[PDB]
Amino acid sequence: LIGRHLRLGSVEEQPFMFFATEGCEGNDCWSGMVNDMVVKLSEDLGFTYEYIQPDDRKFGALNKTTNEWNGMIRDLLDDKTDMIAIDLSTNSARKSAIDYSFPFMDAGIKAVVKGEGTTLNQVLELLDQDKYKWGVIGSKHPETLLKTHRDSRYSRLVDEGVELKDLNHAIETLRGGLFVFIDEGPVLAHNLISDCDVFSVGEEFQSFEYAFGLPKDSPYKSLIDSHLLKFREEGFIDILWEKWSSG
Amino acid sequence: GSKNLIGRHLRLGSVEEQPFMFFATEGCEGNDCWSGMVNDMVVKLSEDLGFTYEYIQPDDRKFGALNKTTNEWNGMIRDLLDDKTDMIAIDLSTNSARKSAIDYSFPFMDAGIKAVVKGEGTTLNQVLELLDQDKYKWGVIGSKHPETLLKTHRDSRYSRLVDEGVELKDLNHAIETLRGGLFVFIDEGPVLAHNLISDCDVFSVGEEFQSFEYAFGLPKDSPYKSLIDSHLLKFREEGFIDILWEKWSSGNSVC
Ligand SMILES: [Mg+2]
């Protein structure tokens, strides 16, 4: 990587990445845990980099009607980027098409709702009532895991729920009440810390990792993997999570 | 790429380390001598990918570490580097020393370093306290991951712990010594949780520390890594890893 330039796919997803839309230029528009990881990788490996957001602003999923990807995954497959630098969740659909780096964080699917004393105990109960609406963000990992789960009642949840645009839209809808938002534990923990009237529905389910995405046969995988492992071993990943997560 | 596992015969490095692997020393032949969480993973991989296999233990019965004097490896790591095996099928901890020499598969379990103690009277809150006292002896298993992490920790007091402690041969020796009392054994969370479930007079020394994974070990440039990784990810996504841990890890406690 010494002398190399990496085009890095990313999107805003706090606290992993924050993207300033004004008042900044280039790489300095980005901040967060993933940015701090990238900065240190760049310093230690000697590459320059830039961040490239997908035009559709999605993480990426495989459309089963067209068999085409979108989001950051598609940009990587199209060779618009060399690596996806974000909290990229590991799933088998993506693994068919791309590789992952060594992982930096366990994560699960988590569901939350506004209003203390919710009667719900598990998300599948949502199918048997009409007091609460619910949803997941389109073309993002939770949607994919629910659509691929063995119990096709999870596909019903996705298909019969609201398709949310992004985290801001989801949180807005959640705060409007009578709405169960299903997403990822670490993202919900950070972003809903001050919402004392938001509570969990059931326990977390599904076991996966956050990692970076790499194209198959990338010449950079071995080095990125080594360095990410060293970050974890040296305590850097935990230090960054303490820095960035609330609170 | 083009190469896959159908019709291949894999030599798999392993050792007993309950509940990941159990090895029967009599009354069995070949693969039937092995059982445990990792064995169940291997059996399913072999059914789905179409390879046959055998397990090969290192003669030294070590997991594997790098000797800084000789610059040579030992244990399962050395057998893999020497092409005696194709993959290390065990709870193989991820560490940077090993990563310089081998690759890892997609991981199947987060783990940390855990210290436990047996003894009445004053006790300890954090392992470095061992260095300023002589009531307790302590140890790590030689050529196993906990020793490597403590020796490579940037606070060299952890190297003092290794150098001034007892070099324990294996898990049975370590647990026997722990049960003898006035001893702190430093090893890995999941192994200690499983094996010390009914030791009501064994307690924690502080919280777990260090963050790493259990995975399988693969030689660099292995043609089988992509397939093994894909299938291990699917095991995790389908809940198979969690189901196996529930099956194999000890529960209740008479404590
Ligand atoms: Mg993990």
Side-chain angles (χ1 to χ4, degrees):
Chain A
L1 282 169
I2 315 172
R4 297 292 196 168
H5 183 71
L6 295 186
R7 302 161 303 158
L8 302 181
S10 202
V11 295
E12 177 164 70
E13 182 83 342
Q14 299 177 14
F16 299 107
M17 283 300 225
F18 296 73
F19 177 68
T21 55
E22 59 179 311
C24 60
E25 169 269 316
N27 293 341
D28 299 327
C29 295
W30 296 85
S31 62
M33 171 176 186
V34 168
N35 183 65
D36 283 351
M37 294 166 66
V38 169
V39 169
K40 184 161 216 299
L41 288 169
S42 174
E43 289 173 353
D44 292 347
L45 289 164
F47 63 85
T48 59
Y49 62 95
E50 69 187 278
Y51 295 107
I52 297 181
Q53 303 196 67
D55 290 336
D56 63 21
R57 293 297 194 275
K58 304 308 177 189
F59 274 82
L62 175 63
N63 186 291
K64 255 112 271 166
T65 312
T66 68
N67 194 236
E68 291 181 39
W69 290 92
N70 68 354
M72 289 181 284
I73 304 294
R74 179 57 177 275
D75 275 8
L76 186 69
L77 294 168
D78 288 345
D79 190 34
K80 291 173 179 183
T81 54
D82 302 294
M83 182 167 76
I84 300 174
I86 198 47
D87 60 312
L88 194 67
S89 301
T90 56
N91 67 52
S92 296
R94 287 165 176 180
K95 181 69 170 71
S96 292
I98 66 159
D99 281 350
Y100 289 99
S101 70
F102 193 81
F104 65 92
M105 187 176 307
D106 275 14
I109 301 305
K110 183 181 175 200
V112 297
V113 67
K114 191 206 190 182
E116 88 99 81
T118 184
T119 176
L120 300 165
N121 305 321
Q122 207 279 330
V123 290
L124 290 182
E125 295 169 3
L126 286 165
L127 297 174
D128 297 327
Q129 59 81 67
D130 48 23
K131 180 183 179 65
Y132 294 90
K133 294 192 193 308
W134 64 88
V136 294
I137 295 163
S139 297
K140 192 183 179 180
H141 167 83
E143 182 189 59
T144 289
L145 281 191
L146 269 64
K147 288 282 276 168
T148 63
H149 196 285
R150 61 177 168 73
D151 183 346
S152 287
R153 291 179 295 170
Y154 285 105
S155 282
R156 287 192 58 197
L157 276 180
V158 169
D159 295 338
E160 295 163 47
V162 178
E163 182 181 326
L164 300 162
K165 184 160 72 78
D166 61 16
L167 192 62
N168 289 332
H169 181 209
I171 289 169
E172 178 180 304
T173 307
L174 170 70
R175 287 171 172 168
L178 299 175
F179 186 87
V180 178
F181 174 37
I182 303 169
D183 198 87
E184 303 179 335
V187 173
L188 294 174
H190 171 74
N191 286 283
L192 301 173
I193 194 72
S194 294
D195 294 75
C196 293
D197 60 344
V198 170
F199 305 85
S200 301
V201 180
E203 307 299 342
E204 294 187 15
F205 59 108
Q206 297 292 140
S207 169
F208 59 90
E209 291 285 354
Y210 292 152
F212 290 172
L214 287 157
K216 290 182 181 197
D217 305 319
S218 171
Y220 304 137
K221 174 165 162 60
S222 175
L223 280 168
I224 293 297
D225 287 351
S226 285
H227 284 255
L228 287 176
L229 169 57
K230 180 174 176 181
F231 285 178
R232 190 164 170 177
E233 181 170 301
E234 291 178 339
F236 185 56
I237 300 302
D238 288 341
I239 286 170
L240 293 181
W241 181 249
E242 175 62 15
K243 173 186 174 183
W244 286 105
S245 71
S246 48
Chain B
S2 189
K3 289 188 203 295
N4 61 47
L5 277 163
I6 304 167
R8 302 286 179 171
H9 181 72
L10 299 187
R11 296 87 41 79
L12 303 176
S14 201
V15 295
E16 178 161 70
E17 181 86 341
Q18 300 178 14
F20 299 108
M21 284 299 224
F22 298 73
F23 176 70
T25 57
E26 64 182 321
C28 61
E29 186 280 331
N31 295 342
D32 295 332
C33 295
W34 295 86
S35 59
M37 171 173 183
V38 166
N39 184 63
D40 285 349
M41 295 165 66
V42 170
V43 168
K44 186 68 67 176
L45 288 169
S46 78
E47 288 172 350
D48 294 345
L49 291 162
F51 61 87
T52 60
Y53 60 93
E54 66 186 278
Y55 293 108
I56 297 183
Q57 303 195 66
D59 297 333
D60 63 17
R61 294 300 194 272
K62 301 311 177 194
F63 274 81
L66 177 62
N67 182 312
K68 287 213 168 200
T69 307
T70 66
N71 198 38
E72 301 271 13
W73 289 92
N74 63 15
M76 288 179 284
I77 303 294
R78 176 62 174 276
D79 277 4
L80 184 69
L81 292 170
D82 288 345
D83 189 44
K84 295 181 175 174
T85 56
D86 302 311
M87 184 168 72
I88 299 173
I90 198 49
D91 61 311
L92 194 69
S93 302
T94 54
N95 67 53
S96 295
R98 287 168 175 176
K99 185 68 175 63
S100 67
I102 67 154
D103 285 346
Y104 289 98
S105 73
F106 192 80
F108 66 92
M109 185 177 308
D110 272 15
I113 302 306
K114 182 174 186 61
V116 297
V117 61
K118 176 171 175 168
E120 297 173 0
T122 59
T123 192
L124 305 167
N125 308 317
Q126 204 278 330
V127 290
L128 293 179
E129 293 174 1
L130 286 162
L131 300 172
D132 300 321
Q133 61 84 60
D134 62 358
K135 173 175 176 177
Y136 292 95
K137 294 179 176 305
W138 67 92
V140 295
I141 293 164
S143 295
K144 189 181 180 182
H145 167 81
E147 182 191 61
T148 292
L149 286 195
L150 271 63
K151 287 283 280 177
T152 63
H153 197 290
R154 295 199 48 203
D155 184 344
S156 289
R157 292 178 294 169
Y158 287 98
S159 284
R160 285 193 58 197
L161 282 180
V162 172
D163 296 345
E164 294 165 47
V166 310
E167 180 183 293
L168 297 164
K169 189 169 84 178
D170 57 27
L171 188 62
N172 290 332
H173 182 211
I175 290 180
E176 175 145 292
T177 302
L178 175 66
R179 286 173 175 158
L182 296 169
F183 193 79
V184 174
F185 177 33
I186 303 170
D187 197 86
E188 300 180 337
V191 172
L192 295 180
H194 174 75
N195 288 283
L196 298 174
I197 188 70
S198 305
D199 288 86
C200 303
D201 55 357
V202 171
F203 302 91
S204 297
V205 178
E207 302 298 325
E208 298 188 6
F209 56 106
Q210 294 293 315
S211 170
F212 58 91
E213 296 281 356
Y214 291 154
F216 291 170
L218 290 155
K220 292 181 174 199
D221 304 319
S222 173
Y224 307 129
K225 173 165 164 52
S226 181
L227 283 165
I228 292 296
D229 288 350
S230 287
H231 286 249
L232 290 176
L233 175 51
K234 192 71 162 163
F235 286 177
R236 187 161 172 180
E237 182 171 300
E238 292 178 329
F240 186 54
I241 301 300
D242 289 337
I243 286 164
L244 293 183
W245 181 250
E246 169 165 56
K247 174 181 171 184
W248 287 104
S249 65
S250 57
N252 293 4
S253 180
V254 175
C255 307

PDB file of all heavy atoms in Angstrom, chain A residues 168-182:
ATOM      1  N   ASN A 168     -31.849   8.515   9.934  1.00  0.00           N
ATOM      2  CA  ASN A 168     -32.562   9.728  10.336  1.00  0.00           C
ATOM      3  C   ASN A 168     -34.076   9.568  10.189  1.00  0.00           C
ATOM      4  O   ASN A 168     -34.849   9.898  11.094  1.00  0.00           O
ATOM      5  CB  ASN A 168     -32.058  10.927   9.531  1.00  0.00           C
ATOM      6  CG  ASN A 168     -30.645  11.341   9.929  1.00  0.00           C
ATOM      7  OD1 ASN A 168     -30.224  11.131  11.067  1.00  0.00           O
ATOM      8  ND2 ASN A 168     -29.909  11.929   8.995  1.00  0.00           N
ATOM      9  N   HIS A 169     -34.493   9.037   9.047  1.00  0.00           N
ATOM     10  CA  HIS A 169     -35.900   8.785   8.790  1.00  0.00           C
ATOM     11  C   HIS A 169     -36.470   7.785   9.803  1.00  0.00           C
ATOM     12  O   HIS A 169     -37.552   7.991  10.354  1.00  0.00           O
ATOM     13  CB  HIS A 169     -36.071   8.279   7.353  1.00  0.00           C
ATOM     14  CG  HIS A 169     -37.492   8.012   6.955  1.00  0.00           C
ATOM     15  ND1 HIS A 169     -37.832   7.066   6.014  1.00  0.00           N
ATOM     16  CD2 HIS A 169     -38.656   8.578   7.354  1.00  0.00           C
ATOM     17  CE1 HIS A 169     -39.142   7.043   5.862  1.00  0.00           C
ATOM     18  NE2 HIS A 169     -39.667   7.957   6.661  1.00  0.00           N
ATOM     19  N   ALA A 170     -35.732   6.713  10.066  1.00  0.00           N
ATOM     20  CA  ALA A 170     -36.175   5.693  11.011  1.00  0.00           C
ATOM     21  C   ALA A 170     -36.356   6.236  12.431  1.00  0.00           C
ATOM     22  O   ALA A 170     -37.347   5.949  13.110  1.00  0.00           O
ATOM     23  CB  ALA A 170     -35.181   4.564  11.024  1.00  0.00           C
ATOM     24  N   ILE A 171     -35.383   7.011  12.883  1.00  0.00           N
ATOM     25  CA  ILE A 171     -35.422   7.534  14.236  1.00  0.00           C
ATOM     26  C   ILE A 171     -36.554   8.551  14.388  1.00  0.00           C
ATOM     27  O   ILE A 171     -37.248   8.578  15.404  1.00  0.00           O
ATOM     28  CB  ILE A 171     -34.062   8.130  14.631  1.00  0.00           C
ATOM     29  CG1 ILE A 171     -33.060   6.994  14.825  1.00  0.00           C
ATOM     30  CG2 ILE A 171     -34.184   8.958  15.917  1.00  0.00           C
ATOM     31  CD1 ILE A 171     -31.633   7.455  14.949  1.00  0.00           C
ATOM     32  N   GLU A 172     -36.732   9.375  13.366  1.00  0.00           N
ATOM     33  CA  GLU A 172     -37.850  10.304  13.306  1.00  0.00           C
ATOM     34  C   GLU A 172     -39.172   9.545  13.466  1.00  0.00           C
ATOM     35  O   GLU A 172     -40.003   9.903  14.301  1.00  0.00           O
ATOM     36  CB  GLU A 172     -37.797  11.041  11.967  1.00  0.00           C
ATOM     37  CG  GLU A 172     -38.908  12.032  11.701  1.00  0.00           C
ATOM     38  CD  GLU A 172     -38.748  12.692  10.343  1.00  0.00           C
ATOM     39  OE1 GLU A 172     -37.678  13.287  10.093  1.00  0.00           O
ATOM     40  OE2 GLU A 172     -39.686  12.607   9.521  1.00  0.00           O
ATOM     41  N   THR A 173     -39.351   8.483  12.682  1.00  0.00           N
ATOM     42  CA  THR A 173     -40.574   7.685  12.739  1.00  0.00           C
ATOM     43  C   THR A 173     -40.748   7.026  14.109  1.00  0.00           C
ATOM     44  O   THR A 173     -41.842   7.019  14.677  1.00  0.00           O
ATOM     45  CB  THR A 173     -40.593   6.630  11.613  1.00  0.00           C
ATOM     46  OG1 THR A 173     -40.364   7.278  10.356  1.00  0.00           O
ATOM     47  CG2 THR A 173     -41.931   5.920  11.559  1.00  0.00           C
ATOM     48  N   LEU A 174     -39.664   6.485  14.648  1.00  0.00           N
ATOM     49  CA  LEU A 174     -39.683   5.894  15.979  1.00  0.00           C
ATOM     50  C   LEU A 174     -40.173   6.884  17.030  1.00  0.00           C
ATOM     51  O   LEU A 174     -41.027   6.574  17.863  1.00  0.00           O
ATOM     52  CB  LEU A 174     -38.280   5.404  16.323  1.00  0.00           C
ATOM     53  CG  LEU A 174     -38.015   4.950  17.753  1.00  0.00           C
ATOM     54  CD1 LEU A 174     -38.736   3.644  18.065  1.00  0.00           C
ATOM     55  CD2 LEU A 174     -36.516   4.823  17.956  1.00  0.00           C
ATOM     56  N   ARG A 175     -39.636   8.089  16.967  1.00  0.00           N
ATOM     57  CA  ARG A 175     -39.979   9.116  17.940  1.00  0.00           C
ATOM     58  C   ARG A 175     -41.425   9.608  17.794  1.00  0.00           C
ATOM     59  O   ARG A 175     -41.978  10.197  18.721  1.00  0.00           O
ATOM     60  CB  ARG A 175     -38.974  10.258  17.833  1.00  0.00           C
ATOM     61  CG  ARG A 175     -37.635   9.888  18.387  1.00  0.00           C
ATOM     62  CD  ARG A 175     -36.601  10.938  18.084  1.00  0.00           C
ATOM     63  NE  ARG A 175     -35.353  10.659  18.783  1.00  0.00           N
ATOM     64  CZ  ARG A 175     -34.209  11.279  18.530  1.00  0.00           C
ATOM     65  NH1 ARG A 175     -34.158  12.210  17.588  1.00  0.00           N
ATOM     66  NH2 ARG A 175     -33.120  10.957  19.209  1.00  0.00           N
ATOM     67  N   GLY A 176     -42.038   9.343  16.643  1.00  0.00           N
ATOM     68  CA  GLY A 176     -43.449   9.634  16.422  1.00  0.00           C
ATOM     69  C   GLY A 176     -44.394   8.697  17.157  1.00  0.00           C
ATOM     70  O   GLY A 176     -45.602   8.949  17.218  1.00  0.00           O
ATOM     71  N   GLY A 177     -43.854   7.615  17.712  1.00  0.00           N
ATOM     72  CA  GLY A 177     -44.629   6.694  18.528  1.00  0.00           C
ATOM     73  C   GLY A 177     -45.363   5.600  17.768  1.00  0.00           C
ATOM     74  O   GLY A 177     -45.554   5.679  16.557  1.00  0.00           O
ATOM     75  N   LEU A 178     -45.792   4.581  18.512  1.00  0.00           N
ATOM     76  CA  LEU A 178     -46.544   3.456  17.960  1.00  0.00           C
ATOM     77  C   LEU A 178     -45.823   2.810  16.768  1.00  0.00           C
ATOM     78  O   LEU A 178     -46.446   2.375  15.801  1.00  0.00           O
ATOM     79  CB  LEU A 178     -47.954   3.900  17.567  1.00  0.00           C
ATOM     80  CG  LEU A 178     -48.809   4.423  18.724  1.00  0.00           C
ATOM     81  CD1 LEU A 178     -50.137   4.940  18.198  1.00  0.00           C
ATOM     82  CD2 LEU A 178     -49.020   3.350  19.788  1.00  0.00           C
ATOM     83  N   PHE A 179     -44.499   2.746  16.868  1.00  0.00           N
ATOM     84  CA  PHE A 179     -43.681   2.263  15.767  1.00  0.00           C
ATOM     85  C   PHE A 179     -42.462   1.515  16.269  1.00  0.00           C
ATOM     86  O   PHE A 179     -41.665   2.064  17.027  1.00  0.00           O
ATOM     87  CB  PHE A 179     -43.226   3.431  14.895  1.00  0.00           C
ATOM     88  CG  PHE A 179     -42.499   3.001  13.646  1.00  0.00           C
ATOM     89  CD1 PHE A 179     -43.204   2.697  12.490  1.00  0.00           C
ATOM     90  CD2 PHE A 179     -41.119   2.910  13.626  1.00  0.00           C
ATOM     91  CE1 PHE A 179     -42.549   2.293  11.343  1.00  0.00           C
ATOM     92  CE2 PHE A 179     -40.457   2.505  12.467  1.00  0.00           C
ATOM     93  CZ  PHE A 179     -41.166   2.206  11.336  1.00  0.00           C
ATOM     94  N   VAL A 180     -42.310   0.269  15.818  1.00  0.00           N
ATOM     95  CA  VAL A 180     -41.162  -0.560  16.183  1.00  0.00           C
ATOM     96  C   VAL A 180     -40.125  -0.491  15.072  1.00  0.00           C
ATOM     97  O   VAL A 180     -40.404  -0.860  13.934  1.00  0.00           O
ATOM     98  CB  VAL A 180     -41.556  -2.030  16.445  1.00  0.00           C
ATOM     99  CG1 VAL A 180     -40.318  -2.862  16.780  1.00  0.00           C
ATOM    100  CG2 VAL A 180     -42.588  -2.112  17.564  1.00  0.00           C
ATOM    101  N   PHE A 181     -38.936   0.010  15.407  1.00  0.00           N
ATOM    102  CA  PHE A 181     -37.833   0.121  14.460  1.00  0.00           C
ATOM    103  C   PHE A 181     -36.884  -1.030  14.725  1.00  0.00           C
ATOM    104  O   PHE A 181     -36.447  -1.243  15.851  1.00  0.00           O
ATOM    105  CB  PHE A 181     -37.137   1.483  14.628  1.00  0.00           C
ATOM    106  CG  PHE A 181     -35.887   1.666  13.795  1.00  0.00           C
ATOM    107  CD1 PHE A 181     -35.790   1.156  12.513  1.00  0.00           C
ATOM    108  CD2 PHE A 181     -34.798   2.359  14.310  1.00  0.00           C
ATOM    109  CE1 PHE A 181     -34.625   1.334  11.761  1.00  0.00           C
ATOM    110  CE2 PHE A 181     -33.648   2.551  13.566  1.00  0.00           C
ATOM    111  CZ  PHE A 181     -33.559   2.027  12.291  1.00  0.00           C
ATOM    112  N   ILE A 182     -36.595  -1.805  13.681  1.00  0.00           N
ATOM    113  CA  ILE A 182     -35.706  -2.949  13.768  1.00  0.00           C
ATOM    114  C   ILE A 182     -34.407  -2.632  13.024  1.00  0.00           C
ATOM    115  O   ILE A 182     -34.429  -2.362  11.817  1.00  0.00           O
ATOM    116  CB  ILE A 182     -36.380  -4.180  13.133  1.00  0.00           C
ATOM    117  CG1 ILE A 182     -37.713  -4.445  13.816  1.00  0.00           C
ATOM    118  CG2 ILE A 182     -35.478  -5.399  13.237  1.00  0.00           C
ATOM    119  CD1 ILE A 182     -38.586  -5.454  13.108  1.00  0.00           C
TER     120      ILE A 182
END
